[model samples]
Target: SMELITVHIVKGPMGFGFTIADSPGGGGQRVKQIVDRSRGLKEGDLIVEVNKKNVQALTHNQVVDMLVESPKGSEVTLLVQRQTRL
Candidate 1:
């Protein structure tokens, strides 16, 4: 499993401009796809933590709550582990 990765949340009129899903095989979440690439997030990145809180066992809804409830324009550190490219 991935350790951690940090991500910043830049709130926009349409929201954070990204989406997440359960990691393949469970145990964590992954960045499904990023509508905006400028945020530094990429698809398939495994999310291991949220704002320093471990989310290895958190559900999709739980993680969404954490992100949506955060202050706008604030940095929401997401500990993610990107898949290695062969």
Candidate 2:
């Protein structure tokens, strides 16, 4: 049920509408509450990297802060481990 997925999202009006669930094992940050804004991103998708750095061991707030470094309305790549519902 788990497979890796990559999504290129632009930080725009939708703001990549999704929620981050802090996890301790298996992976770093788990994607949650994915709204309609994102393309191909879904819930239960584990966030393993942003740009090129691994962020699974990072705190939720810290990831948010890291994201802030990239300017808004710019394209950002997210490496997601998507777990499809069986």
Instruction: Write down the TM-score of every candidate.
Output: 0.80, 0.82
Please give the TM-score that candidate 2 achieves against the real structure.
Answer: 0.82
Worst ten in a row by lDDT for model 2? 18-27
lDDT of each: 0.76, 0.77
lDDT of 2 at 26: 48
- Candidate 1, residue 71: the lDDT equals 77
Q: Give me the candidate number with maximum TM-score.
A: 2
Q: Per-prediction RMSD in angstroms?
A: 2.4, 1.9
Give the per-residue lDDT of model 1 (tens digit) for 1-86: 44345776667656677888997789788888788723777788888887778999889999999878877666666777876555
Model 1 global lDDT (CA atoms, 0 to 1): 0.76
lDDT of predicted model 2: 0.77
Off by over 4 Å in 1: 1-4
